[PDB]
């Protein structure tokens, strides 16, 4: 009834596969003879898909730029055409000048349209290659079976919408775990938020587009999924199924585990202990931590509120603050105003390693902190900064 | 005919006034003494107004930021209220949480409104101070008279919409010269364009707002004029009267004078000789430089075409190119595509100082180049980069 936590994913489905193999959660079926050959198949699929998404991102950028060029040229042509139409009978040099001024704009517009068509054809070429990639991924997934079912898997965040190749692979792996009754919890993260932002727009009839605070290269794995949806390689029905059953139910603002005499607090970013009380304040949850069980119950109630916001497609209401200058170093006022932003964006440093930030004993119970990768290394023996593919076990 | 040229004005009416005194174009009337005390009164007005426009720029920026806060908060509130429907379907617990979310946004909206109102109050206080300043300027303009009417005045550009206090002062001084039959030519410039862009919009009933490529601090003197217009201290009718009679007719793409054996080319930016044919190509002007007279006639035709664009409120058609990355360092392609932008934005540097860029003799005639101040110093004796320290008169033998 223990758990293993993974703090280093960055939207990279190979890293999830690596973690699941190395901790004996999954294994190849008996029929597979060559482990390294079978595993290298996914590495190759993943790399080829990564290259296709890179190609897509460059096409996306060029298409956006060319559409600005086309719209500008069209507006300028229309303006000159109105001036010519409104001309007086004594404006022959005026009309002659404007007629010849319009020609280079028309030529630029034709060149931009031709360029746009070529980029659309390149995108069409990508679409013809995408099914082959997915079919090879599907064949790989049929070679896998569950091994250990008794261990809770915890992902500390940035599992989607990050620097890897494709959130579809990751969602499919989460759904494989769901179909095999594996207990899994995922901490809400700053990259996870970009994904959820896009998904809850999609299901209300807005574009499946991220918030866009994080740049496209740093949410590449979202674009790897969106490419499949926009090119009709996967159905919106399947995306909704994966997200609704295998992803959203796992999400926690904060997770915990209880020992005989202590609590362990799992967060995405490194966080002060008192940020939990601030999160309770924003969400209308009564905060109590007099005992480890009371703090556990407080956190349960925070996570129930998260599920209410997500079920209503309104998580974005808790993640909007246009006055924060640096979400990795939020001021006292900013932390109080937007505690969930702090919980997913904070980065530790020496000035934050102070007395009372993260006590190791509190109200007579021990407190252990486990969070996702962060550059700063705290010397506190009860702070675990998971910047490795190796999992952290919870003990007896 | 002789001329004087000013290459460093930067929207500063004091610099213009000093230039006109220094070269004996104007003088105080004999009833004024002491002369120093009268000039110093205009200096005080100008500096007083300069500080006022600085205050105005600070208010403008703060108001623009506050309007962003206000609009953001209003959208979020309206968003939440729309989600607060309906009460019935036991979203009650959830209604409560959304109501609590709304409270800090409403508090931030109210705070931003109070700040906006106090800034609009500050602007109102500024407004009450403006009339006296214009009154003192008007008194000063009654104290001067024309002196030399036989010298052509050439402004090499950035005469308006630049770093000084107020384009109204400058336009009134231009009108004074116009009223006294002074010949004036002004070279079209990058700050000049910001002014004209706004003025052309005003003429056709659009807001008196600049293109906005140049930052507000660097077009301060436009804002000092716009402050008078928007606060109803001067009329739209007066402003247009001044611009139509005393400013727009003087404008040139490039100007020239002819000597017995050469041509002198006056520009705002330092420019390559081959920029002239590029300007001709965009304007549909037949280009001919086989003789200095043919080149002079080409430039005359460029300037006639400029006046068509000016008269029809459409100069913006020649100054729009969203593809240029650095207007001060345009590529060959960019120069061919937008030659007038090149003519007003180019900044020279060592890489541009090459043998055929600006030849001193061409097709049998000498070529001399005169342009507004530019930091790079070319060691060509026939290139005149008119920092304020350089002599302003035309060289011997040039006939303007
Ligand atoms: Br006309
Ligand atoms: Br889509
Ligand atoms: Br902190
Ligand atoms: Br001077
Ligand atoms: Br106005
Ligand atoms: Br050049
Ligand atoms: Mn993160
Ligand atoms: Mn480590
Ligand atoms: Mn200068
Ligand atoms: Mn300039």
Author numbering:
A (entry chain A): 23 to 418
B (entry chain B): 23 to 422
What sentences appear in the manuscript?
Here we describe the crystal structure and biochemical properties of WipA (or IcmW-interacting protein A; lpg2718), an effector protein originally identified because of its dependence on the IcmSW complex for translocation, but for which the function is unknown. The crystal structure reveals a two-domain structure comprising a metallophosphoesterase attached to an 85-Å-long α-helical hairpin forming a coiled-coil at its tip. Although WipA exhibits a serine/threonine phosphatase fold, it functions preferentially as a protein-tyrosine phosphatase (PTP), even though there are no structural similarities to the general PTP fold. The protein forms homodimers in solution, and the dimer is mediated by the tip of the helical hairpin domain.
